[PDB]
Design an enzyme around this catalytic site. Structure first.
Site, mmCIF file in Angstrom:
data_model
loop_
_atom_site.group_PDB
_atom_site.id
_atom_site.type_symbol
_atom_site.label_atom_id
_atom_site.label_comp_id
_atom_site.label_asym_id
_atom_site.label_seq_id
_atom_site.Cartn_x
_atom_site.Cartn_y
_atom_site.Cartn_z
ATOM 1 N N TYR A 149 0.849 -1.181 0.000
ATOM 2 C CA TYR A 149 0.000 0.000 0.000
ATOM 3 C C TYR A 149 0.893 1.242 0.000
ATOM 4 O O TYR A 149 2.100 1.157 0.298
ATOM 5 C CB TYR A 149 -0.967 0.047 1.202
ATOM 6 C CG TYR A 149 -0.223 0.324 2.496
ATOM 7 C CD1 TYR A 149 0.390 -0.719 3.204
ATOM 8 C CD2 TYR A 149 -0.201 1.608 3.035
ATOM 9 C CE1 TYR A 149 1.069 -0.458 4.381
ATOM 10 C CE2 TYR A 149 0.461 1.880 4.205
ATOM 11 C CZ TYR A 149 1.096 0.843 4.878
ATOM 12 O OH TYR A 149 1.791 1.167 6.041
ATOM 13 N N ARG B 272 7.979 4.972 -4.629
ATOM 14 C CA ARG B 272 8.064 3.899 -3.592
ATOM 15 C C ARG B 272 7.100 2.743 -3.894
ATOM 16 O O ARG B 272 7.464 1.553 -3.780
ATOM 17 C CB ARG B 272 7.769 4.420 -2.206
ATOM 18 C CG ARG B 272 8.002 3.369 -1.136
ATOM 19 C CD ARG B 272 8.092 4.037 0.192
ATOM 20 N NE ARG B 272 6.811 4.627 0.573
ATOM 21 C CZ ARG B 272 6.637 5.288 1.709
ATOM 22 N NH1 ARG B 272 7.674 5.428 2.568
ATOM 23 N NH2 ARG B 272 5.445 5.799 1.990
ATOM 24 N N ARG C 253 -6.647 -20.950 -3.714
ATOM 25 C CA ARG C 253 -5.696 -20.779 -2.620
ATOM 26 C C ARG C 253 -4.463 -21.712 -2.788
ATOM 27 O O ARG C 253 -4.599 -22.930 -2.876
ATOM 28 C CB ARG C 253 -6.412 -21.041 -1.266
ATOM 29 C CG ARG C 253 -5.491 -20.762 -0.074
ATOM 30 C CD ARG C 253 -6.045 -21.071 1.355
ATOM 31 N NE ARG C 253 -5.004 -20.624 2.316
ATOM 32 C CZ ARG C 253 -4.148 -21.407 2.985
ATOM 33 N NH1 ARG C 253 -4.238 -22.736 2.859
ATOM 34 N NH2 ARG C 253 -3.238 -20.862 3.822
ATOM 35 N N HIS D 112 0.138 -21.170 -2.053
ATOM 36 C CA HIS D 112 0.978 -20.106 -1.566
ATOM 37 C C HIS D 112 1.777 -19.391 -2.697
ATOM 38 O O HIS D 112 2.002 -18.195 -2.618
ATOM 39 C CB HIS D 112 1.996 -20.630 -0.520
ATOM 40 C CG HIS D 112 1.417 -20.848 0.850
ATOM 41 N ND1 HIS D 112 0.518 -21.859 1.125
ATOM 42 C CD2 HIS D 112 1.638 -20.209 2.022
ATOM 43 C CE1 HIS D 112 0.196 -21.818 2.406
ATOM 44 N NE2 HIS D 112 0.864 -20.829 2.974
ATOM 45 N N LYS E 235 -0.904 -19.164 13.367
ATOM 46 C CA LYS E 235 -1.204 -19.297 11.961
ATOM 47 C C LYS E 235 -1.942 -18.031 11.539
ATOM 48 O O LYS E 235 -3.159 -18.055 11.574
ATOM 49 C CB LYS E 235 -2.065 -20.570 11.683
ATOM 50 C CG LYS E 235 -1.216 -21.859 11.948
ATOM 51 C CD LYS E 235 -2.096 -23.147 11.868
ATOM 52 C CE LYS E 235 -2.424 -23.446 10.410
ATOM 53 N NZ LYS E 235 -1.202 -23.668 9.533
ATOM 54 N N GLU F 127 11.431 -23.310 9.744
ATOM 55 C CA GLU F 127 10.333 -24.098 9.186
ATOM 56 C C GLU F 127 10.284 -23.921 7.663
ATOM 57 O O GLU F 127 11.058 -23.120 7.095
ATOM 58 C CB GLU F 127 9.002 -23.665 9.807
ATOM 59 C CG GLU F 127 8.757 -22.206 9.556
ATOM 60 C CD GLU F 127 7.678 -21.601 10.463
ATOM 61 O OE1 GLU F 127 7.220 -22.290 11.383
ATOM 62 O OE2 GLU F 127 7.296 -20.427 10.242
#
Lengths: 288, 287
Positions: free
Chosen positions: B37, B60, B112, B114, B154, B186
């Protein structure tokens, strides 16, 4: 088509995926302010059987507690919601394995980092087919790579900043100044500057505008680490941001900053900030 | 006056009242926090609303988009025109007060998963809001701050995990195992385990894999696992709800020991299936 469950501002619906939409000021969209849990639901004897449902729901309850969201359901309530969403997708799942994806956010409010007062959590639940790894993947194994664990950008993954802003609000403070390894980093939503002996300091990359303002005023600037001890013995402390412009910090963890009044470097940089604005206004008027 | 906002999703755009503006639930901004943003202040001056340092703000934005691999939807002129549009649409509502424009870009809507989705189209959201600058008293008296340490759950603030999943995808790998201070942390979406001399290890804080180990008689220890120990492990495994347990047989193009899954994997995987079998049998009995 997947059928999904969505609850926003205390209204719920069970709808085709194409119809499920969330308000743009949901804090899940603006700030990443929410948690999720996945429950595997295995095909067995013509039913779909959740696995470790109690452990998964316990983890979801702990995640919510960890970020201060009141759990919208008890265990029975979540089980019923899961049962509902799986059954509504029965034909699409067939006799394949599935997963249930649960997401809770802090809900919809005016944009601001700290927790809003009147917010009702958003709840989203959906189910999709689950393709477990293959016999061959299991037999041959998989390939991984390594990388350094991962800041410099304004992302919308802002749960960290939210929590630090809430940390400040809880303490009737304007901002939380963060420290790492006894060095100053930044505020939840601002950059931090200090003054000692008439010189201006910021942590190592600065910021072009304030450097320009310092230059204009004849004030020497150096970016270097600022220790916590240096912060607590500063002559002045200031915060900057697009929306704060520049502000003096006069109390730090309830102790005064030098004499507890704003200092002369703040006064000079603040007036320079306003001149920078005046110049852009004059360029605007010329074009107009 | 109801704020009017701009929204562009799946390459379709609209300028609508705030109460009407909604994004698909699978937008990656909602699911993964996968976006950036920028805020542009717009000051009241002589009856107009004048953006401040707009070129610096848009530069930016452009750099941030490039950093996380999202194609920039506009050049500088295009962004300035969109901002000018959103402010003018809200003219009445802003009155003679200061304002800000909030711009948000996300990687867009997909199934969905990643890693970056194929041919994703970025989502763009812009709105105005009144800007109340600090008071003359806040400036005169100053403000109060507190300090805290810069830092388990999570969350849906997952842009880091997205970038690590995409890092693996770029390299045709299954997963990225992350290192911090030369110790294993992880995966982008899994927990990591190693085996050495028939003993099971994981980094310090699964109750489930620990249960499985216990059932098999396999000693388990939570302790830091160094990069050296990872690379010389007898076995490496990944776990997650959707992966169950899997053996890792290649790590950065070197085999893990002999390159084939080992006996601790075989034991834990069969125990995982017995745990499922038992849940099924309990289900069958209550049904």
């Amino acid at each position: 088509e997947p059928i999904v469950y969505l609850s926003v501002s205390a209204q719920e619906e069970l709808v085709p995926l194409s119809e499920a939409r969330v308000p743009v000021l949901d804090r899940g969209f603006i700030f990443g302010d929410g948690v999720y849990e996945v429950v595997p639901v295995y095909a067995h004897d013509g039913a779909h059987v959740p696995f470790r449902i109690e452990q998964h729901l316990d983890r979801l309850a702990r995640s919510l507690k960890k970020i201060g969201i009141d759990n919208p359901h008890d265990a029975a309530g979540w089980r019923a919601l899961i049962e509902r969403v799986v059954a509504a997708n029965a034909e699409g799942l067939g006799d394949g394995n599935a997963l249930v994806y649960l997401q809770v956010t802090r809900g919809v409010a005016k944009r601001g980092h700290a927790f809003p007062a009147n917010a009702v959590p958003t709840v989203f639940a959906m189910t999709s087919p689950l393709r477990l790894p293959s016999e061959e993947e299991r037999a041959k194994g998989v390939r991984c790579v390594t990388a350094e664990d991962r800041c410099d950008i304004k992302s919308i993954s802002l749960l960290g900043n939210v929590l630090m802003a809430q940390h400040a609000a809880e303490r009737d403070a304007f901002e939380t100044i963060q420290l790492r390894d006894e060095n100053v980093t930044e505020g939840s939503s601002s950059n931090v500057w200090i003054v000692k002996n008439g010189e201006l300091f910021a942590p190592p990359r600065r910021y072009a505008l304030v450097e320009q303002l310092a230059d204009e005023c004849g004030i020497r600037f150096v970016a270097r680490e600022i220790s916590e001890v240096e912060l607590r013995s500063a002559d002045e402390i200031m915060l900057t941001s697009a929306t704060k412009e520049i502000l003096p910090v006069t109390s730090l963890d309830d102790l005064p900053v030098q004499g507890g009044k704003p200092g002369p470097v703040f006064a000079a940089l603040y007036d320079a900030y306003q001149r920078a604005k005046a110049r852009e206004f004059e360029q605007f008027d010329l074009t107009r």
